Amino acid sequence: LRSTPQDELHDLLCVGFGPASLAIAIALHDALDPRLNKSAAQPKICFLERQKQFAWHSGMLVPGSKMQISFIKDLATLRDPRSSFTFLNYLHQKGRLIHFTNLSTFLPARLEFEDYMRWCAQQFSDVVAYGEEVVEVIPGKSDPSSSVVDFFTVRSRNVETGEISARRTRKVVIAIGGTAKMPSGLPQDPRIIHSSKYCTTLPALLKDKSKPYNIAVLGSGQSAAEIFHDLQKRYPNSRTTLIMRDSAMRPSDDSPFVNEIFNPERVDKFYSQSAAERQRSLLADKATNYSVVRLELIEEIYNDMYLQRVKNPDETQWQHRILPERKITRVEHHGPQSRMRIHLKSSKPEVKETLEVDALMVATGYNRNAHERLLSKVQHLRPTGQDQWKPHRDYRVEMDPSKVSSEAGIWLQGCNERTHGLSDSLLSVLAVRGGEMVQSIFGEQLER
Amino acid sequence: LRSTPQDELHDLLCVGFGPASLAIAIALHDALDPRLNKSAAQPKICFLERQKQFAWHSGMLVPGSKMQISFIKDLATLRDPRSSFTFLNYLHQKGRLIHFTNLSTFLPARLEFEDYMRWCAQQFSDVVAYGEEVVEVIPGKSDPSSSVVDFFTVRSRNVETGEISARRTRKVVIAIGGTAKMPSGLPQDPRIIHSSKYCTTLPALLKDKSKPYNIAVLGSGQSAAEIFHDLQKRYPNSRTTLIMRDSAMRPSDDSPFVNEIFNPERVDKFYSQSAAERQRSLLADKATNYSVVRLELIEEIYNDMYLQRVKNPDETQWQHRILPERKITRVEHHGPQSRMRIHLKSSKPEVKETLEVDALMVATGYNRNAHERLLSKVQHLRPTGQDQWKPHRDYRVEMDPSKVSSEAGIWLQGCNERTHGLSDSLLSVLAVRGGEMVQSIFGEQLER
Amino acid sequence: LRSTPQDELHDLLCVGFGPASLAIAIALHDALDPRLNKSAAQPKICFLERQKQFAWHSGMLVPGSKMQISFIKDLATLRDPRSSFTFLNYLHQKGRLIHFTNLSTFLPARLEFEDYMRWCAQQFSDVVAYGEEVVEVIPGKSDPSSSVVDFFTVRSRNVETGEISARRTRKVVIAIGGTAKMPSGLPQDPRIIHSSKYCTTLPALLKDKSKPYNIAVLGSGQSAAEIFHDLQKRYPNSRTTLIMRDSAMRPSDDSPFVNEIFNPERVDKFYSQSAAERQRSLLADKATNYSVVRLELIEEIYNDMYLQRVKNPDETQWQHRILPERKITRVEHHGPQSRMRIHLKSSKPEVKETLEVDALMVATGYNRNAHERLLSKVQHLRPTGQDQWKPHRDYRVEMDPSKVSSEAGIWLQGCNERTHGLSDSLLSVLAVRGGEMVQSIFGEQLER
Amino acid sequence: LRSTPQDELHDLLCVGFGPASLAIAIALHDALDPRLNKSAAQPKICFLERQKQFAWHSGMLVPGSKMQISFIKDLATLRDPRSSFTFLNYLHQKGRLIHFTNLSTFLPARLEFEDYMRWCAQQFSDVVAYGEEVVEVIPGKSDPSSSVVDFFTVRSRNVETGEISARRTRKVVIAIGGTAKMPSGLPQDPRIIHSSKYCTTLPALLKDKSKPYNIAVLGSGQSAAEIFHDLQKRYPNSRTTLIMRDSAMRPSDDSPFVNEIFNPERVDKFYSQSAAERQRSLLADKATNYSVVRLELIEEIYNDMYLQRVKNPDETQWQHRILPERKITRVEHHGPQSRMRIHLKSSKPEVKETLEVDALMVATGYNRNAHERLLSKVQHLRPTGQDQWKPHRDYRVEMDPSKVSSEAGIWLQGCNERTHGLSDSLLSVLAVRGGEMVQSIFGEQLER
Ligand SMILES: Cc1cc2nc3c(=O)[nH]c(=O)nc-3n(C[C@H](O)[C@H](O)[C@H](O)COP(=O)(O)OP(=O)(O)OC[C@H]3O[C@@H](n4cnc5c(N)ncnc54)[C@H](O)[C@@H]3O)c2cc1C
Ligand SMILES: Cc1cc2nc3c(=O)[nH]c(=O)nc-3n(C[C@H](O)[C@H](O)[C@H](O)COP(=O)(O)OP(=O)(O)OC[C@H]3O[C@@H](n4cnc5c(N)ncnc54)[C@H](O)[C@@H]3O)c2cc1C
Ligand SMILES: Cc1cc2nc3c(=O)[nH]c(=O)nc-3n(C[C@H](O)[C@H](O)[C@H](O)COP(=O)(O)OP(=O)(O)OC[C@H]3O[C@@H](n4cnc5c(N)ncnc54)[C@H](O)[C@@H]3O)c2cc1C
Ligand SMILES: Cc1cc2nc3c(=O)[nH]c(=O)nc-3n(C[C@H](O)[C@H](O)[C@H](O)COP(=O)(O)OP(=O)(O)OC[C@H]3O[C@@H](n4cnc5c(N)ncnc54)[C@H](O)[C@@H]3O)c2cc1C
Ligand SMILES: NC(=[NH2+])NCCC[C@H](N)C(=O)O
Ligand SMILES: NC(=[NH2+])NCCC[C@H](N)C(=O)O
Ligand SMILES: NC(=[NH2+])NCCC[C@H](N)C(=O)O
Numbered sequence A, B, C, D: 001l002r003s004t005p006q007d008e009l010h011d012l013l014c015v016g017f018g019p020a021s022l023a024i025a026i027a028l029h030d031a032l033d034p035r036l037n038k039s040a041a042q043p044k045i046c047f048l049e050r051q052k053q054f055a056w057h058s059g060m061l062v063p064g065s066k067m068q069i070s071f072i073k074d075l076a077t078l079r080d081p082r083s084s085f086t087f088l089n090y091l092h093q094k095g096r097l098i099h100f101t102n103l104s105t106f107l108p109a110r111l112e113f114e115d116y117m118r119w120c121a122q123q124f125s126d127v128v129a130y131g132e133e134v135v136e137v138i139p140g141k142s143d144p145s146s147s148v149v150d151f152f153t154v155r156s157r158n159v160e161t162g163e164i165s166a167r168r169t170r171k172v173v174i175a176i177g178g179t180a181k182m183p184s185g186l187p188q189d190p191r192i193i194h195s196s197k198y199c200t201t202l203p204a205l206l207k208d209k210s211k212p213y214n215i216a217v218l219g220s221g222q223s224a225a226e227i228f229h230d231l232q233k234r235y236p237n238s239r240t241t242l243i244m245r246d247s248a249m250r251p252s253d254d255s256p257f258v259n260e261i262f263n264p265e266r267v268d269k270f271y272s273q274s275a276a277e278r279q280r281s282l283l284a285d286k287a288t289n290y291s292v293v294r295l296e297l298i299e300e301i302y303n304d305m306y307l308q309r310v311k312n313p314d315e316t317q318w319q320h321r322i323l324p325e326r327k328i329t330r331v332e333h334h335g336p337q338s339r340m341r342i343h344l345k346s347s348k349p350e351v352k353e354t355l356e357v358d359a360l361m362v363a364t365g366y367n368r369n370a371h372e373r374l375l376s377k378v379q380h381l382r383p384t385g386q387d388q389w390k391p392h393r394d395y396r397v398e399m400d401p402s403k404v405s406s407e408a409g410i411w412l413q414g415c416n417e418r419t420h421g422l423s424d425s426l427l428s429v430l431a432v433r434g435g436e437m438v439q440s441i442f443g444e445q446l447e448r
Helices: A019-031 A087-093 A097-101 A110-124 A195-205 A222-234 A258-262 A266-272 A275-284 A295-311 A371-381 A430-447 B019-031 B087-093 B097-101 B110-124 B195-205 B222-234 B258-262 B266-272 B275-284 B295-311 B371-381 B430-447 C019-031 C087-093 C097-101 C110-124 C195-205 C222-234 C258-262 C266-272 C275-284 C295-311 C371-381 C430-447 D019-031 D087-093 D097-101 D110-124 D195-205 D222-234 D258-262 D266-272 D275-284 D295-311 D371-381 D430-447
Strands: A010-015 A045-049 A128-130 A132-140 A151-158 A164-174 A192-194 A214-218 A239-243 A320-323 A326-332 A340-346 A354-357 A359-362 A409-412 B010-015 B045-049 B128-130 B132-140 B151-158 B164-174 B192-194 B214-218 B239-243 B320-323 B326-332 B340-346 B354-357 B359-362 B409-412 C010-015 C045-049 C128-130 C132-140 C151-158 C164-174 C192-194 C214-218 C239-243 C320-323 C326-332 C340-346 C354-357 C359-362 C409-412 D010-015 D045-049 D128-130 D132-140 D151-158 D164-174 D192-194 D214-218 D239-243 D320-323 D326-332 D340-346 D354-357 D359-362 D409-412
Touching (some): A010 A151, A010 A430, A019 A045, A019 A110, A045 A164, A087 A097, A087 A110, A097 D295, A110 D295, A132 A164, A164 A371, A164 A430, A195 A222, A195 A359, A214 A222, A214 A354, A222 A239, A222 A295, A239 A354, A258 A266, A295 A320, A295 D097, A295 D110, A371 A409, A409 A430, B010 B019, B019 B045, B019 B110, B045 B132, B045 B164, B087 B097, B087 B110, B097 C295, B132 B371, B164 B371, B222 B295, B222 B320, B239 B354, B258 B266, B295 C097, B295 C110, B409 B430, C010 C019, C010 C151, C019 C045, C019 C110, C019 C430, C087 C097, C087 C110, C132 C164, C132 C371, C164 C430, C195 C359, C214 C222, C222 C239, C222 C295, C222 C320, C239 C354, C295 C320, C371 C409, C409 C430, D010 D430, D019 D110, D019 D430, D045 D164, D087 D097, D087 D110, D132 D164, D132 D371, D164 D430, D192 D195, D195 D222, D214 D222, D214 D354, D222 D295, D239 D354, D258 D266, D295 D320, D371 D409
Parallel strands (some): A010 A045, A010 A164, A045 A128, A164 A409, A214 A359, A239 A320, B010 B045, B164 B409, B192 B359, B214 B239, B239 B320, C010 C045, C045 C128, C164 C409, C214 C239, C214 C359, C239 C320, D010 D045, D010 D164, D214 D239, D214 D359, D239 D320
Antiparallel strands (some): A132 A151, A151 A164, A326 A340, A340 A354, B132 B151, B326 B340, B340 B354, C132 C151, C151 C164, C326 C340, C340 C354, D132 D151, D151 D164, D326 D340
């Protein structure tokens, strides 16, 4: 794709260049390829990224981490396996395809799947601005005296300098993913770090890999266990503690009949379900994604735990402990020492031990309400009284017909789980979704 | 153990000779063995069985069925691995121990684990009366003019003849397991059979294994899937239908941290938990037992399902279908034909297809309220106003100190899940429980 | 590809339309596709098949049989994953790609992989003649008075009618695969059937699936075990016997470091090795292919074997027996009965039991010397004294420069294991090989 | 068992207190136990150990190492699962039996299986002399003027002091296991260490775990891979090289039909086989034990190898390399540097790279000819001309009837593979063998 001057009115502007946005670029590429598309000027497009270059959750690129989805659900295959942008094609291009096969694995390393996506991302370098974090989407009318909005202005603070530029577009896509979630009862402290910053910020706080540190992990999801399992290797002399409110780490559900809610086609049937059944579906199918660990990592962790029992039959004296059904009441981070003091209570409804730590990893997951801050200026374009954005099946936010021109729009991606299903936040349907997105955004063009 | 004349007052009488009762016999055996017990007249004991000989759920001994618990949790090992009555010893005695090892399996076939238990059961043939189904436990006072109950009479209808005999005992144990549960909206019909009668009664109704029958299964638990998976093999020309109210068959949870609620020691900690936390524990740990299928059988079933898709892309035309999220509203069993008519509806809250079948297997699980009918005569011995039996930690039912002598008692087994945990109904703690039972029942004796 | 009139001189004629020939068609297709090839009249080509339509070893399409190679080593992916003719693309076209993924298997069913290949084969129906079995390749000179051979005539007996036609070509490819191998000490009998005819001919001999037959299997390779394992299901009342000269069925070796001899690139390094090292390589790497069973099927078979031991501790009285280290000395097939008599001896170097059977399946593998019969007329074109065809790296048979024009040639496929390695007879390198073949055959054309 | 004064004539003296000797102690214990044996003065017995306390290959107790045999083939179960000395009983005694079960593993850690055996070994501390390494077995005649030998003197150098004591016995057992094997073309050097000394001596040579060392491993068996896989963890900055003469690391064969040669009963049938068939059996069943790695560790190692390819596509620049089909011609260990220089050649029959290393681990396996040195004084008691010890089925060495009294003997253990089979050197039949040994040695006593 060719670059568009900043000054010009774009056909489409995307906020975020993670997997979801990247899949749109790919599908737009493919739709325009006469090789893959017998039908096939070029659309004027731009992607804006807070990061200085493409990375995929670098703060959680723990050594040994695997991806949790089949390599077949890559960025292109499910829409079209002929596509240039498939995992297998990427592998072939690196000279690794015969070698990957010999693993007989469906689950590449996280590190490798990032490079596949980085290899995709580099081919849209003409149309992606990096280090540009979007601070607001603002309505605009080509006819200032008229009462009709037909474009949107999107402004971003430069990460390096701080300068704010603007780029005008008819259509907007917010694919920003998630923001780190932090329990409200936790104080602000450099010792207190969220899982998303584990690889990037913990090495600078605990600079000595040799030192007898005390480290704690709050959580029982996938992040929790990866960190907890990594701490034993990365800090061999540390005493690690895993605090969780549940009784146990629970296996993630990938069973073939359950796993079909992740089918691209099921999105239509899911969307069509009532709110009662959607709330019901997500709550029953919870263990496909949330607060669950991969079985193999549970078994790996348990087996380490058992090894300690062979060495010492007294559990309180182990190096690496698990404390189930505990909440945190007080944190003391003003004591003169290098170690802050964590107070614990039974997570059961109606005073346990007190821990001293050099760091606290909080692996409490992610929220997905980040678009609100960007769209508050655009809130007055909804139907009267509507205090929440309503996404349609094509992902366009319902707006007011008399206030917004049909050419103008805003789509959301990765936040629509409550309307589209458990696959929305994930990699599952990105190939097909991207293709569908190219259909709603550019479909006027692509028909002629 | 030596036999006791019918006429005499027993130290202990057990209703039921399934695994739970059998484990008590074993533990009593072991406690009295000077080889295993340096401490060691013989207690006067009797077991009463409805069945004519020991069998372990023969109506569900489906070809290929595996047991779902480690062979280590056999009837004796966890109390004492030296015991004569371990699985490995049984295997050694059959000349199969070197051979079993080569399987490298923890899960014997159901058929084989029955023979192990049948091999145990045959060694108490002196003290077990078969074909004797217990119809009531009745209080008795050695001093008729006194207001104190010190024994219990237990009467049983002979399965062959119908005659009723009685046997007096100081202590009683009700280990009767479960009774088949049947949805109330289902009519009484020979075509309608519960999973517990699948192997024993379905061959007599559908006598021709060749014939193009239509068979249906109601359920999504382990019984459901075994029957459903067996129907394809046992009736090759039949059209099978699996009806379930859930969206999908769900994997059973055997993950190492979760599976620790099944630890013998955890029973104490569980018992000590409040009612709020117990209700909470069982509901969160649900998938360790109820409404769940073994992962391997789900995968086996799915893969068969996929094979059909390779043959025909039209799902309505498959031989073996799954109908998810459907309830049954009407059953028509008065039509002139060999086939009764099943009407279905969405199990979702607010009219689908109508099925015609030659048989309906209902795999709707088991209830465990069967002791009430036997204990209603004994209900007036509880504390004032108590309308439910309260089991203590040792499993003795709380009674009235001023109405019942300390020598006299009643214990329950396999119904106390609500107070003892998910392991109660199962094989998990039987070795240790039996040993504990021998401690409460015979512990006065065994101290001297 | 467009059809060529019979009368005209072809650029290339292939004998056989199995996987190897089919991969050449595919690679030729791809080389000529401007979509996949920016470089891209059409070559005049023809494939001649003995079978009336494409099938892939239909006589061994046993129920439940899996393929033994990754689906990635399909007919196109390793040359180019973008290709229209990949497994994943085929699946996508059938609407099964999301469904196949949920299996999380690398090994499709044999039945399914045949349909994938049948789906490929149908797209060259213009250039493939079916029911045409090739009986000889014959030299021809455009200049009869000259001493130079520049074309070859290829004649085939019509399977339906018997008529013999001829088609002239400059280049020839013999990709006929293998012929059934039969021990010389076995007499000719309809009761004696080779594994390759198991599905197609055994049902007509043993017409009653109910009947208490005695069936025997000679062999210990993959064919042996599939038949043996299938007999128990397909004939439930039969007594099956597996005779083998080895002590045991041995696991096939798919271990990642060993499995790299199957890498496309390794063919060059293998070809370059001396005869001493090649003989050495194939003999050490034997268990990657020959006389070996898949581990899972060994375990499946063993576990069935153990089930019988639980039922009867006497091994001679089992329904399904294995007789290790036995050879067959006499066969008696002239007795009046329906059952011929098999005499056995220790396969050990220096009289055991005698079996009576209704059928004998011989699973003794395949030879690959079938091209000789077709090429005997062409033998005088080799270098003086050369009594064996020498294949080059590009697979062209070395011939005499002064007797054969450079435009004229003969290539071999699937028989060159002794020079190309264990992957030659298999599906391993077909994608890449086909592409390489298109390079040697059509490379003059494709450069311009 | 009670201690015997040094001065007295013993019934039995064992050289070695590893698993084999320890199993004899256990079986003797069990035979004498009236609990396990209704039949049951005590035999006068002594075990002599070079080590200061019981350890099981401590120099190869690599972190993470698993045992390669089922826990069922422990020291007692296969003879009698009731025995006090079973693994499951040991676990129960440690309070780990419920916990071990939750692993659902048949293969305990090496570290744990050592503690089980150490827990056995501690119960014969009365009859085991530690730090006593046996230097010779010497004939003795109670009647010096007679020509009949009826006892043996056994002398041992004290490891601490050097003093030599003697103990007289009628019967002797040499269960010394194996001695480290070293290629003859390797020079004597502290940098050159055999796998058996890896954990115990390499930490003292390479004292800094941080330092960028170059380390090499010669071998492709289990020892090779464990060391190679451990080096990456234990020395994170080292460059490791695995040199092997084979093309690849090969999977160990544990397949159920093959694995039956390890059956206790098969020893009789094996022993009875001719020398031609024995040589044949061991050579065909080679991969059950020798020059083979566990599949999981091969896959683990391969996957690490692949991870490097994702980081760098140039193989020569990887940190951890495998060099297949290479032999070592010259070693240079006189250069001034800390690094000696290794020269390599193709292991193929008819000059490659030269490596520089700080250490060389040689994992070239074990020989088992160590008894000769101890028995040379006893050689004149064999039949005329016999220059090799012949073990009988009961393991007694054939001797001369006219020179040796029937009360006097010598048994061998763990060296008799050539006559008893692949299980001899291993843990497979120790339970049963020990019991059989107690039968031949003490059977006169135990009948009365
Ligand atoms: C550690 C981890 C591993 C995961 N792996 C799996 C897996 O195995 N399989 C799977 O299917 N899913 C997994 N996921 C779920 C994950 O949400 C998706 O895989 C995927 O990241 C979805 O990407 P996205 O399009 O939501 O964008 P995200 O990856 O969430 O990132 C959006 C991008 O927009 C940028 N951005 C944010 N705000 C702004 C702004 N104001 N202006 C400009 N740019 C902005 C961000 O920096 C980022 O580059 C994982 C999640 C985590 C935390
Ligand atoms: C098909 C199936 C398979 C199972 N396998 C597993 C497994 O893999 N692992 C596991 O741990 N658990 C499993 N269970 C759970 C099962 O409840 C226990 O394994 C076990 O059967 C518990 O036995 P129990 O002592 O409750 O007696 P039960 O086996 O329930 O039987 C009690 C006995 O008392 C007899 N009886 C009943 N009423 C009377 C009366 N009035 N008078 C006299 N006698 C009477 C019955 O005929 C029976 O013999 C399974 C359950 C089913 C249905
Ligand atoms: C049961 C079975 C399963 C197998 N599956 C595996 C597997 O899992 N993975 C794997 O990699 N390999 C496997 N193979 C190995 C097999 O050789 C290859 O997979 C594959 O069939 C190679 O095909 P080919 O090109 O040699 O042709 P083949 O499949 O051997 O057939 C050649 C074709 O030429 C035709 N033909 C023969 N003679 C003539 C003539 N005179 N004139 C005209 N036409 C003729 C034949 O009818 C046939 O159509 C399997 C083999 C068998 C027996
Ligand atoms: C690292 C490793 C792991 C193994 N694990 C497995 C496994 O997973 N499964 C399995 O079945 N087999 C395995 N083995 C094979 C091993 O040979 C047996 O498991 C077992 O050690 C056999 O023991 P043994 O009786 O031969 O005595 P060994 O263990 O070989 O030791 C004999 C004892 O005698 C002592 N001794 C030696 N010479 C003298 C002397 N002159 N005087 C006095 N004492 C002496 C030694 O110090 C030693 O204590 C393993 C081998 C190795 C090297
Ligand atoms: N635990 C997760 N993050 N799961 C997300 C992927 C869901 C499922 N593996 C799929 O096939 O799409
Ligand atoms: N699905 C079941 N029936 N589970 C019962 C057994 C629970 C668990 N396997 C245990 O170790 O005790
Ligand atoms: N047993 C066999 N037929 N093996 C042939 C395939 C070899 C190996 N699986 C590969 O990757 O190519």
